[PDB]
Amino acid sequence: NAPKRPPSAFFLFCSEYRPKIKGEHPGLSIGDVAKKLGEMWNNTAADDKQPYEKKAAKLKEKYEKDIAAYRAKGKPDAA
C-alpha cells in the first residue's frame, strides 16, 4: 500500500550528477550526498528547478490522489 512519494524536484537533479559528486567525493553517505545536494538544489538557480520541479510535482500529485484515495478507502482497487 502507500503509492509512496515520487521525486521531490531534488530527485531529478540529484540523479543527473550523483555518480559525479560521488566520483569527486567517494566519501559521502545518505547524509552527505543529501546535504551536498540539499545545498546545490537549494542553489541550482531555482529557475533551473522549475523544469525538474514541475515533474516532481506531476508525480507527487498522482500520489496525492492515490493516497487520498488509499487512506479514504482505496482498498477495493477497482475489482
Q: Is 12 left (phi over 0), alpha (psi -120 to 50) or beta?
A: alpha
Q: Supply 8's cell numbers.
A: 521531490
Both ends of the chain: CA-CA distance in Å? 16
CA-to-CA distance for 22 and 68, rounded, in angstroms?
37
The CB-side HSE value for 79 (13 A sphere, CA atoms) comes to 4
Domain ranges in the chain?
1-79
Q: How was this structure determined?
A: NMR
Of the options 1.10.30.10, 1.10.3720.10, 3.90.1150.10, 2.60.40.1530, the CATH number for the domain spanning 1-79? 1.10.30.10
Closest CA to 35 of 16, 6, 14, 4: 14
Task: Tell me whether residue 39 is exposed, middle or buried, using C-beta atoms within 10 angstroms of its C-beta: 0 to 12, 13 to 18, 19 or more.
Answer: exposed
